[PDB]
Amino acid sequence: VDTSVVSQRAKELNKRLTAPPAAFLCHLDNLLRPLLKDAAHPSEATFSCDCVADALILRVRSELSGLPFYWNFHCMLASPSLVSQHLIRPLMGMSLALQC
Amino acid sequence: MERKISRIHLVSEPSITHFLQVSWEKTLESGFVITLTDGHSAWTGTVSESEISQEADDMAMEKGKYVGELRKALLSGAGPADVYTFNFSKESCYFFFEKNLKDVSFRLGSFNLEKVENPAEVIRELICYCLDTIAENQAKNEHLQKENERLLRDWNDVQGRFEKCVSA
């Protein structure tokens, strides 16, 4: 997603906001990075998953400065090129390196 | 019927300090009357339980902390890590207050006030209430000082009394 849709989805999900896309993405990164980098780190970040039709809705709910902050990733099935380039070839590379 | 006065600097007119009085019956949850003034004119409005409940529900925030946020904002009692901004549209007589993050403006509350027809009465009532509170506080402080002096004298005497007792 680019910056144009970030503002629209922020307006739709959590209303009564007056923030630009840059600050929204900065907050999202500050929320997400600590969890992904290391686990077992309570950060009041509720994660939920759902599927509707060949799609994955990933809902993240957080509290910044004691106020709600909702975001939804509307992920769609990845193309064959992306899946291969991100999982298949690297895996064979690691296998060959370990064999060596 | 408790009341609280606060000083607010509207963004529209930073150079002027406006006064905001919030009156509640027994608890902040039951609704409150808000009067905003600048020394010449005043606007008065009311908020009931239904309005506050609906506003809390719309925000999708737990009602246990919405009242706390309103207390920290309207009553001007808050720490250094939080800042609130109030805006008042005169023509639309619309008063909304929000919490200001780093370029992330979150709205907290919005109400509509009506122009009063007796500004002098409101100002006089505010001044009289302030003077009465000052007088009551002074009397209470004097009474507390007298009690403290009495206790100090009693303790000073009993010290020597204990000295004599241990001597015997």
Side-chain angles (χ1 to χ4, degrees):
Chain A
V1 87
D2 67 348
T3 165
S4 86
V5 179
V6 166
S7 68
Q8 195 272 135
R9 198 173 294 158
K11 299 282 153 192
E12 293 336 273
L13 282 164
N14 44 7
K15 278 159 194 69
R16 75 168 59 212
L17 261 70
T18 320
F24 197 84
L25 295 189
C26 161
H27 288 11
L28 203 72
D29 206 33
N30 257 46
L31 161 53
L32 261 287
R33 280 258 85 82
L35 208 156
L36 294 145
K37 172 154 77 205
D38 51 287
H41 195 354
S43 85
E44 59 268 15
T46 324
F47 280 74
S48 321
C49 208
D50 196 31
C51 319
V52 55
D54 321 290
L56 192 91
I57 308 314
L58 203 79
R59 324 178 122 83
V60 312
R61 157 166 204 290
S62 146
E63 262 76 3
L64 58 100
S65 299
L67 305 99
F69 168 90
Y70 303 170
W71 184 246
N72 286 2
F73 306 91
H74 289 206
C75 320
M76 271 305 190
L77 266 162
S79 38
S81 147
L82 229 59
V83 152
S84 100
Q85 173 174 60
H86 282 262
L87 271 164
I88 291 172
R89 303 210 284 288
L91 277 165
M92 305 197 337
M94 333 202 301
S95 297
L96 297 164
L98 293 162
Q99 196 78 12
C100 272
Chain B
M1 277 82 74
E2 298 82 31
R3 302 146 45 109
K4 184 84 161 306
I5 325 302
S6 36
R7 262 167 294 169
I8 52 160
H9 284 84
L10 291 165
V11 298
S12 173
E13 332 193 313
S15 47
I16 300 169
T17 165
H18 289 34
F19 295 109
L20 166 137
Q21 106 177 288
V22 194
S23 45
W24 62 85
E25 301 253 33
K26 178 156 51 47
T27 169
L28 194 40
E29 270 87 345
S30 317
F32 43 78
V33 165
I34 283 166
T35 316
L36 181 137
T37 181
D38 74 329
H40 263 242
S41 323
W43 307 256
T44 176
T46 87
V47 165
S48 56
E49 183 77 74
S50 55
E51 282 178 340
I52 177 161
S53 266
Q54 178 269 346
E55 287 186 17
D57 179 22
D58 192 306
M59 201 156 298
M61 151 170 26
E62 308 110 321
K63 206 252 173 75
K65 50 155 54 147
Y66 185 50
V67 174
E69 289 295 327
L70 249 70
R71 190 194 322 279
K72 276 214 287 277
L74 276 165
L75 279 56
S76 206
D82 42 30
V83 86
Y84 306 85
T85 64
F86 317 82
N87 221 343
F88 189 63
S89 152
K90 295 282 201 143
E91 301 338 289
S92 206
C93 34
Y94 204 67
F95 180 72
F96 65 53
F97 73 100
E98 28 177 58
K99 177 171 285 211
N100 249 23
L101 275 65
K102 176 60 169 175
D103 284 322
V104 188
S105 145
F106 266 55
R107 193 173 303 239
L108 221 60
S110 77
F111 329 112
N112 35 20
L113 299 122
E114 26 192 46
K115 169 167 270 289
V116 84
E117 295 302 320
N118 324 61
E121 266 68 21
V122 175
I123 303 190
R124 282 205 246 91
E125 213 283 346
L126 205 144
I127 296 174
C128 263
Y129 164 80
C130 285
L131 286 165
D132 291 17
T133 301
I134 291 156
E136 156 286 330
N137 280 342
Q138 288 226 77
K140 164 172 311 173
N141 266 55
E142 194 85 60
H143 167 229
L144 257 52
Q145 269 292 347
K146 267 170 187 207
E147 298 313 315
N148 262 39
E149 299 333 301
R150 267 174 68 270
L151 261 69
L152 171 61
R153 257 194 342 278
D154 202 330
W155 184 93
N156 294 346
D157 159 276
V158 175
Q159 274 298 87
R161 303 314 324 310
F162 228 78
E163 298 325 308
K164 172 54 184 178
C165 154
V166 298
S167 314

